[PDB]
Design a protein around this ligand. Structure first.
Ligand SMILES: [Zn+2]
Ligand SMILES: [Zn+2]
Ligand SMILES: [Zn+2]
Ligand SMILES: [Zn+2]
Lengths: 85, 119, 85, 120, 85, 120, 85, 119
């Protein structure tokens, strides 16, 4: 379900949220996609927001796993709670 | 109407300056695929345009997997967060002077607004 | 909606089907996924079936776009009807 | 319920290339180091943790497609090639030669797995 | 896919939209649901909007079929275009 | 965190009919009996349990549509009528007159709720 | 997720599974629906299987809530574990 | 081809005996809605048939909410568990002697198989 924070999502669950966004990316319109994106921006708290998805750094894989890795390293470097474990 | 125009050659950073001046032009190779084609509306042209972009090896490689998927179904790629404007979060096509590709350019929402505002 | 022939799918619609398969790929079980994969194998008619998805040739991109492109070329090369146009 | 033990074996860039022969592919040593002394509720739990660790190993993950890496990331076994499936068994399976001893665990295709248990 | 006019929906397709709304009705949050409801209100153009779904008149059935029937009759009665046919 | 207390009040077949007036509708007594002395993590937890119990009460559930009953069943507040919404607040809200005292809790439409807190 | 037994599903989660089935009921084909139905039959262990959904007893409401009630009473009457609580 | 035939009147238990003999007939009211209509195939007729059924107040009330939803999109209602046969779990239309509604009936999968088997 759409939790409120990263701490409620296991790495696998977050990947499922990313694949849902990938599905809406190819939908006829962005009505649903943009709501899922706002949710993603909200819970990750990363300053670059959606860029993590649409403009991945060249220092990591452009994939659900790479997105989770970057978020994981950033949240750790900033003393914020990580994914559920 | 029918699509006309030549467009211009672009580098491996085609939309690098879409947020400046009048943005990026229609790539010549893309203009070669759409030229002389009919479209019911500009929206149809916009959809075909983006679909063509995703099929161009040199251009597609300039976008993330998620953005290529969008273009593949006719939707504009999302811009960087810094370039959005309200609910307008994807690149837009600006008419300089409606199917003259030489009068069409790709701009970010933020820049597009500034253009029609005198900036 | 699941058609029954490639000729009923536009390239865009087929990508949506591939995205649905990617979403089920990360689902808890393969119950739904496997049904979507059987449909894919059935309509594509490619001898390697699901390999196009899970074991893409290196001479092509590992992406929905690459999958559609290879199917398109393989079907055309074998005189079979192409995507709706 | 128990703890994972074993050292596993070194592997190259073609790890599962022989999963369809003999006893299949061994548990990679790097993977064994990450699972050793870890406690699991069941073997199924070990299997999930196993594949997840595989998805995080740079050298191993690069050996799979984007779609297969997504499967392993959530703990599901990667899909085998079409030629190595057996009916509804379409993903790599873990075989015990002799429950959490990683040196007695190997990865095999369903087709090969079936023949192993039938003296082949 | 979310169209933008009732004339793009066959009665069957509209029922599918109503089913999607029922699924989100039971989802953890209303994030997606509310977007689907705005779309419903927009394309139907009925003054009572979401009431057709959550507060159906007693003179009609509380079902997807009843909702489509009432919209169909109300739109026809007001000279607006009907479902795709 | 705390326990639910209170007796609530008797209601008829038009329970929320006045949720848009005064202090709104009271917690039904039958509902209070089912939640009394129950412990909740937060008020939000109470709210979910509250609506769920409403969906199980024959006399109350019949007062809502099929779509609204499905919402309450999963613990979400039922949607109000269009005329009683306020912006993005489109579902019934619980108001505290004076945290788990059910006799100080009532159900109000968002529109009315806003006016209550603004001396109206 | 598609759990293995009723004991893994809270009443609300089971209702979500029922609404997913309601959505597939109106899909173009029954490919996905029939897989969800087999899963429903499997975990409920009720002898009438799908009849609980398509042929509800007149002694209870034809609804997700009524279906859950019947399953709940039947599983209790047969000393089987109930929904997660 | 075009749909022809009169059908027959049915009670509040129309498909009550769909698993016996030749099953249930096309209701007269339903035949009045489909008569003289053209269909690309029998499958098209089947879809239209079920959609018509869901619109008939007297017939629809004979089905659960889930089954009405199926018919509303042109799919056959699911039969009772006891009447299914393998993956055939929905009512089927049997041709007695292809658009003559007077030669068409609704049967369960189990009965349909027995019919073409001499039983
Ligand atoms: Zn412009
Ligand atoms: Zn074995
Ligand atoms: Zn208040
Ligand atoms: Zn027959």
């Amino acid at each position: 379900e759409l939790k409120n924070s990263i701490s409620d999502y296991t790495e696998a669950e977050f990947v499922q949220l990313l694949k849902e966004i990938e599905k809406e990316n190819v939908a006829a319109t962005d009505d649903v996609l943009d709501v899922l994106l706002e949710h993603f921006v909200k819970i990750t708290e990363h300053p670059d927001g959606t860029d993590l998805i649409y403009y991945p750094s060249d220092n990591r894989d452009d994939s659900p796993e790479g997105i989770v890795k970057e978020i994981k390293e950033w949240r750790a470097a900033n003393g914020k709670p990580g994914f559920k474990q | 109407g029918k699509a006309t125009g030549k467009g211009k050659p672009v580098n491996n950073k085609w939309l690098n300056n879409a947020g400046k001046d009048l943005g990026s032009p229609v790539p010549d190779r893309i203009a070669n695929k759409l030229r002389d084609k009919e479209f019911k509306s500009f929206d149809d042209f916009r959809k075909k345009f983006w679909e063509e972009v995703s099929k161009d090896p040199e251009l597609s490689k300039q976008f993330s997997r998620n953005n290529n998927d969008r273009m593949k179904v006719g939707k504009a790629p999302k811009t960087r967060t810094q370039d959005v404007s309200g609910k307008r979060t994807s690149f837009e096509l600006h008419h300089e002077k409606v199917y003259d590709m030489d009068d069409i350019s790709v701009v970010t929402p933020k820049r597009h607004i500034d253009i029609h505002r005198g900036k």
